Design a protein around this ligand. Structure first.
Ligand SMILES: [Br-]
Ligand SMILES: [Br-]
Length: 118
């Protein structure tokens, strides 16, 4: 897989293990209808906002190998949920090297860069 910069897609998080395929990478495919392609660093603001929008990332769901997130965790977000937060001015920082090029179908690279940690 490739990142938004054209390089090899780096791991987003190995602990907690993230990604739709739970291999730590924000890679996607047919079954990942949510397109978990944006590697972002969680902020309390985003976590609270996205829960208000019906996306609970704080409650653990072990049956989904989901631990419940905390500020500081890096996690592969659905492009749409990151986009929604960006329009609300609360999008969490992006790790470009761990963000799949597929993210470019939802967000412009310049917008991703403006929010990058890297
Ligand atoms: Br798939
Ligand atoms: Br998400």
């Amino acid at each position: 897989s490739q990142n938004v910069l054209g390089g090899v897609l780096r791991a987003c998080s190995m602990d907690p293990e993230t990604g739709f395929y739970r291999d730590g990478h924000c890679r996607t495919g047919p079954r990942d209808t949510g397109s978990h392609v944006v590697c972002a660093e969680m902020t309390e603001a985003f976590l609270e906002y996205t829960k208000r929008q019906g996306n609970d990332l704080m409650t653990p769901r072990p049956e989904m190998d989901f631990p419940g997130l905390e500020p500081g965790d890096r996690w592969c977000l659905c492009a749409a949920r990151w986009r929604e937060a960006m329009e609300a001015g609360v999008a969490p920082p992006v790790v470009l090297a761990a963000t799949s090029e597929a993210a470019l179908k939802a967000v412009d690279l310049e917008v991703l860069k403006a929010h990058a940690v890297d």
